[PDB]
């Protein structure tokens, strides 16, 4: 087992978390493991912003390995920004450690209400170098160099709330997690984990659309026009100006997303993208889909996709591998 296993834990049964620690001593932190960003950031004791009151904060001075820096930074996400400065110290992922460069965030003001409302402390990126600020080598890519893991790849098995936890295996593929054969999809870029696939919903097809397998996104993102065309004949109710698309969970018109390559066919049925909203109305559900237009027609296969499919992100071969996750471990 020259490969880790960070037990992930469900957050409000949509997203999920996993820990890691900075500072040469322990200093544990809960992170959102983001295959959609390449920058590890942590709240510093120097944080002055309210968002930190609930967070675990980092003390460089309490850590022998702290290598200073201070280059101010601004980490921008599609959902928020977080400011701070670079610093270096050990990072203990699972049991493996390595001198890693990160960001000591001290202002979390532009990441609200998300931050104050969530239980994670930081965001640990698992993406490609070109997606990073300060050009940091990917943890898993650096670990391989550092002969700590043989294969520079990471597995993801999302926990299913009251069923089982999940795992972030680092360095190898555990069959315990997946059913059926794995199928590999070569990256179209070494940025995000972006593969190319044909999108097909009703008889709406956007062939060769960009597909970003992002674990940091709670929803399945869709090019706006696609969203607008998709929700036309269904009996879906969008509240004016709000990305709140309410359905009866039994709506027989609900489409089944279906992305395919010449290697495999991946589908996400209503069961995986719908979100029960019984408190609002009995028998009601919401889509968990968002209109979002990237420069080039992109879909974002977030938590819902990865929650059905066991995924393998391989830095060495430059591809993502999709297999069906095991309903239970």
């Amino acid at each position: 087992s020259s490969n880790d296993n960070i037990e992930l834990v469900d957050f409000q049964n949509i997203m999920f978390y996993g820990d890691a620690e900075v500072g040469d001593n322990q200093q544990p932190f809960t992170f959102i493991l983001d295959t959609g960003s390449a920058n590890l950031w942590v709240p510093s004791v120097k944080c002055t912003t309210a968002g930190c009151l609930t967070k675990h904060l980092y003390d460089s001075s309490k850590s022998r390995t702290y290598e200073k820096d201070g280059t101010k930074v601004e980490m921008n996400y599609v959902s928020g920004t977080v400011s701070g400065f670079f610093s270096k110290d050990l990072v203990t992922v699972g049991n493996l450690s390595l001198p890693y460069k990160f960001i000591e965030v001290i202002d979390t003001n532009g990441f609200e209400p998300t931050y104050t409302a969530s239980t994670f402390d930081g965001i640990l990126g698992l993406g490609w170098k070109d997606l990073s600020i300060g050009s940091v080598d990917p943890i898993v890519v650096e670990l391989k160099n550092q002969n700590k893991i043989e294969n520079a790849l990471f597995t993801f098995y999302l926990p299913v709330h009251d069923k089982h936890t999940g795992f972030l295996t680092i360095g190898g593929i555990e069959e315990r997690f997946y059913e059926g054969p794995l199928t590999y999809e070569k990256l179209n870029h070494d940025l995000y984990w972006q593969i190319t696939l044909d999108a097909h919903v009703g008889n709406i097809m956007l062939e060769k659309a960009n597909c970003i397998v992002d674990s940091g996104t709670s929803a399945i993102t869709v090019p706006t026009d696609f969203l607008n065309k998709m929700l036309q004949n269904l009996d879906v109710i969008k509240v004016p100006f709000l990305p709140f698309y309410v359905t009866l969970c039994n709506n027989s018109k609900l489409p089944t997303f279906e992305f395919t390559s010449e290697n495999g066919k991946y589908t996400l049925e209503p069961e995986y993208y719908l979100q029960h909203i019984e408190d609002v109305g009995p028998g009601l559900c919401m889509l968990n889909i968002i209109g979002l237009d990237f420069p080039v027609p992109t879909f974002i296969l977030g938590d819902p996709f990865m929650r059905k499919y066991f995924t393998v992100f391989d830095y060495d071969n430059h591809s993502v591998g999709i297999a069906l996750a095991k309903k239970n471990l």
């Binding site: 959102i32 390449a38 998300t114 995000y192």
Partner: peptide
Amino acid sequence: XVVXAX
């Protein structure tokens, strides 16, 4: 929701 880098 949360769509995570620019």
